[PDB]
């Protein structure tokens, strides 16, 4: 839900390409609907990878 999305990107978990996003007012372009991914060591990324038990930990997340 979008409230949870503002929770996550206000806690600073996501990035678009390289740079992290802290404010929810950043709207994206047509180009950057593909590199919307969390940062690494984001523990939600860690918990979903360990849910699928594809949790690789050599890549530090």
């Amino acid at each position: 839900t979008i409230q949870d999305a503002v929770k996550f990107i206000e806690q600073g978990h996501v990035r678009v390409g390289p740079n992290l996003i802290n404010d929810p007012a950043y709207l994206v372009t047509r180009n950057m609907e593909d590199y919307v991914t969390w940062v690494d060591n984001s523990k939600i990324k860690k918990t979903l990878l360990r849910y699928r038990n594809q949790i690789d930990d050599f890549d530090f997340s």
């Binding site: 919307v36 991914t37 969390w38 939600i44 918990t47 979903l48 849910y51 038990n53």
Partner: peptide
């Protein structure tokens, strides 16, 4: 089912993936 599978989008996060494993 195969179409959902190949459009999985592996950033699929919910809150129930601490009861499911």
């Amino acid at each position: 089912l195969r179409e959902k599978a190949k459009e999985r989008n592996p950033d699929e996060y919910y809150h129930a993936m601490h009861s499911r494993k």
